[PDB]
């Protein structure tokens, strides 16, 4: 992508989105990141949509294959999918470390990137057998939580989505169901008290998911 203009990469990422070509969309946004300028709010969202779709297809295949596994063929093909999944997560973590996080221009942007870092270590944790990977996920999420509580309102949709995901980490990955429940419940109650200030449609969608999970866990 090095010979194509930054503006052209961003335009083609939007075309690939409309066409449902998510592998191409991700390659175009990686090219744009490596140009070295800071991303706008619409550009961060393109980068997130592209990789989440690619890694989402790989996770749903790994789970079908793990379930079949319970002749070396099933184990071989499951390991193949697993290594491609790991390559995608390691490419994203490399972009965030080099140098999106360090160069971010404000709180809103730095929180978005640290949430992404926690999400991609968490996807690595799902297929590992590791304690170190879980410790890296927890630490990225905790740094994002600390900044967001000081710099953004309780209804901001990135603050809310960050709390939802850190809650799922506690319940599904780190075996702390008490911590997941308490976080989800405190998060929902504080956003509820702040609705009157909305902006209002964005927040209520993630609140609903917090409540759904509470019902399941409780």
């Amino acid at each position: 992508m090095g010979s194509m203009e930054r503006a052209s990469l961003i335009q083609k990422a939007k075309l690939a989105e409309q066409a449902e070509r998510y592998e191409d969309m991700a390659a175009f946004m990686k090219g744009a990141v490596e140009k070295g300028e800071e991303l706008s709010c619409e550009e961060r969202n393109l980068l997130s949509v592209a990789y989440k779709n690619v890694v989402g297809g790989q996770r749903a295949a790994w789970r079908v294959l793990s379930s079949i596994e319970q002749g070396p063929e099933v184990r071989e093909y499951r390991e193949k999918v697993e290594t491609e999944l790991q390559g995608v997560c390691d490419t994203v973590l490399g972009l965030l470390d080099s140098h999106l996080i360090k160069e971010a221009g404000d709180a809103e942007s730095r929180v978005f990137y640290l949430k992404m870092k926690g999400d991609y270590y968490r996807y690595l944790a799902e297929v590992a057998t590791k304690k170190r990977i879980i410790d890296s996920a927890r630490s990225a999420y905790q740094e994002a939580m600390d900044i967001s509580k000081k710099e953004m309102p309780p209804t901001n949709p990135i603050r809310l989505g960050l709390a939802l995901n850190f809650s799922v980490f506690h319940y599904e990955i780190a075996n702390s169901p008490e911590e997941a429940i308490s976080l989800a419940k405190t998060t929902f109650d504080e956003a509820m008290a702040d609705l009157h200030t909305l902006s209002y449609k964005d927040s209520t969608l993630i609140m609903q998911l917090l409540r759904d999970n509470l019902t399941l866990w409780t």
Binding site: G56, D119, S167
Partner: peptide, 8 residues
Amino acid sequence: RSTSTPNV
């Protein structure tokens, strides 16, 4: 499975 943030 619990639900995480959807891909807007």
